[PDB]
């Protein structure tokens with residue numbers, strides 16, 4: 482059945498709740514972003530109103546075939562009325578089209594649902610600054626102090642410099658990047674830009690990227706693999722076997738692969754700086770795991786919450802075990818006593 486942390490009290494609304502069949506009492510289903518654990522259940526047979534960003538609505542229409550009449554895209558940073566309730570969509574700094582949702586309840590309660598987000602000090606100057614938030618439905622993915630990671634800018638600098646050096650030493654090296662969802666497009670687009678190439682990819686993945694309103698995209702991507710020296714593959718093919726296989730398919734155009742796996746977190750982060758990252762190598766194949774995150778680090782999360790000062794926090798991630806739930810609740814109380822709210 483639908484869990485309580487997916488329901489917005491005082492409304493007929495749910496968030497990211499498409500796999501429970503008809504939710505009793507639901508008048509509008511919000512979708513924060515186009516990731517499968519959140520859209521799970523949508524298809525061309527869905528006949529209830531879906532509220533989302535423009536980009537998420539492009540993916541619903543083109544990838545899932547949801548009928549246009551049930552897609553309700555809203556502009557960001559704009560007061561909108563949905564079934565008599567004021568809402569605002571805010572950029573969540575997650576994947577393309579991902580939003581946070583502000584609900585202004587008829588009784589005067591204000592609720593922020595972060596969806597999935599990577600907290601940023603820029604958020605402290607959005608429409609959030611303008612009123613008090615009483616309840617926070619929080620993306621707690623990395624809510625423990627072991628989770629540190631570098632800025633996205635530092636990670637992309639490392640990837641650009643590594644790729645440019647390799648290909649300049651060996652003009653017959655191929656760069657491969659893994660993907661299994663939207664998000665993290667900066668990794669492959671930045672590397673292709675420094676090398677003067679388009680990114681080559683499957684017809685399915687090209688279609689997906691063409692829904693994202695990315696500026697000048699026709700100039701950066703292609704389905705012609707032969708004309709590209711940065712290839713995108715399924716994350717599952719980023720291993721020695723899969724890459725050896727791919728290299729055979731390129732017909733002797735290349736004699737070396739340098740591959741990137743943008744993971745979330747990996748426990749090399751507790752010890753190792755970005756400067757000191759090294760690949761796994763076999764033969765003429767090297768694989769780099771780079772800590773490019775689209776979720777908050779522990780410190781980023783803590784800063785956002787201590788700035789916002791909510792009266793009540795409802796975690797949305799890691800809620801399945803008592804030990805996780807109790808650990809998170811202890812951090813929330815620490816943050817509140819340190820900051821004085």
Ligand code: NI
Pocket residue numbers: 514516575597
């Ligand atoms: Ni996500």
